[PDB]
Write a protein that binds this ligand. Structure first.
Ligand SMILES: [N]S(=O)(=O)[C][C][C][C+2]1234B567B89%10B%11%12%13B85%14B%1158B%12%11%15B%139%12B%1061B%12%112[C+]5%153B%14874
Ligand SMILES: [Zn+2]
Length: 257
């Protein structure tokens, strides 16, 4: 039932998923002046050399690129994390225009889009078990601004015409997610949740300070995706972002001064 529209969007989700009003919901606004530099935080370790992408999929909340998570091939460690987190998939959230689309905001600034690389804690064995734990998932969030093209995104862009409508997938092997990362691994971190149903409070968020630049042509191709299935009335897949939620009793920590 849930989506991003007037009658099924974020303001409705709490009816099916009451944790939507919980104590550690995501996304949030990152107030840069309030976030505290924490010298005890470690550099983030992103080890994607052996990543094995499998498929690209439209699921009617985004498109995702899925990875083989049956071994420690593409793992996130260090930073605020204890233990090892396997990359399952990445996906994006984006807007109808360049002034909105991100889920996290920075001093209330919205970016054109936000990339999420979703990882789960190997100590829970599978992602379904991991979502039931407060330290089950680590999501690496990366902001997208519009300017110069991101060459490492183009392979993704070019297959989106083949997964237009909900239910469509394609082979998407040999994709290297290192090509989506900014130079700096400077980050903010806080305890939060999935930003889609089931909104489980299972995520350590790691949001990079440095955005990547993508071209207008690249983001335009995101906006040609459809929320609907083939044969149903066409609804452009745009504005698939949850707004910032109350910070409540949480501290956002910065890895950098
Ligand atoms: N925007 S987000 O918080 O990264 C949630 C992405 C969708 C998920 B949630 B957890 B399991 B549940 B299933 B898998 B895992 B995360 B990916 C899909 B959905
Ligand atoms: Zn997401």
């Amino acid at each position: 039932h849930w989506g991003y529209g007037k009658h099924n969007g974020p303001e409705h989700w709490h009816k099916d998923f009451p944790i939507a009003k919980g104590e550690r919901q995501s996304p949030v606004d990152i107030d840069t002046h309030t976030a505290k530099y924490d010298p005890s935080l470690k550099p983030l370790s992103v080890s994607y050399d052996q990543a094995t992408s499998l498929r690209i999929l439209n699921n009617g909340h985004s498109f995702q690129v899925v990875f083989d998570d049956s071994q420690d091939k593409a793992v996130l460690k260090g930073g605020p994390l204890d233990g090892t987190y396997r990359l399952l998939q990445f996906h994006f959230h984006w807007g109808s225009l360049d002034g909105q689309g991100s889920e996290h905001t920075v001093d209330k600034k919205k970016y054109a889009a936000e990339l999420h690389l979703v990882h789960w804690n190997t100590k829970y064995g599978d992602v379904g078990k991991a979502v039931q734990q407060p330290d089950g998932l680590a999501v690496l969030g990366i902001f997208l601004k519009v300017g110069s093209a991101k060459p490492g995104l183009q392979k993704v862009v070019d297959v989106l015409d083949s997964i237009k409508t909900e239910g469509k997938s394609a082979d998407f092997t040999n994709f290297d997610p290192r090509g989506l990362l900014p130079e700096s691994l400077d980050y903010w971190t806080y305890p939060g949740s999935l930003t889609t149903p089931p909104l489980a409070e299972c995520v350590t968020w790691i949001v990079l300070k440095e955005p990547i630049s993508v071209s207008s042509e690249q983001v335009l191709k995101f906006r040609k995706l459809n929320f609907n299935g083939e044969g149903e009335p066409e609804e452009l897949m745009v504005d698939n972002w949850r707004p910032a939620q109350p910070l409540k009793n949480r501290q956002i920590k910065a890895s950098f001064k």
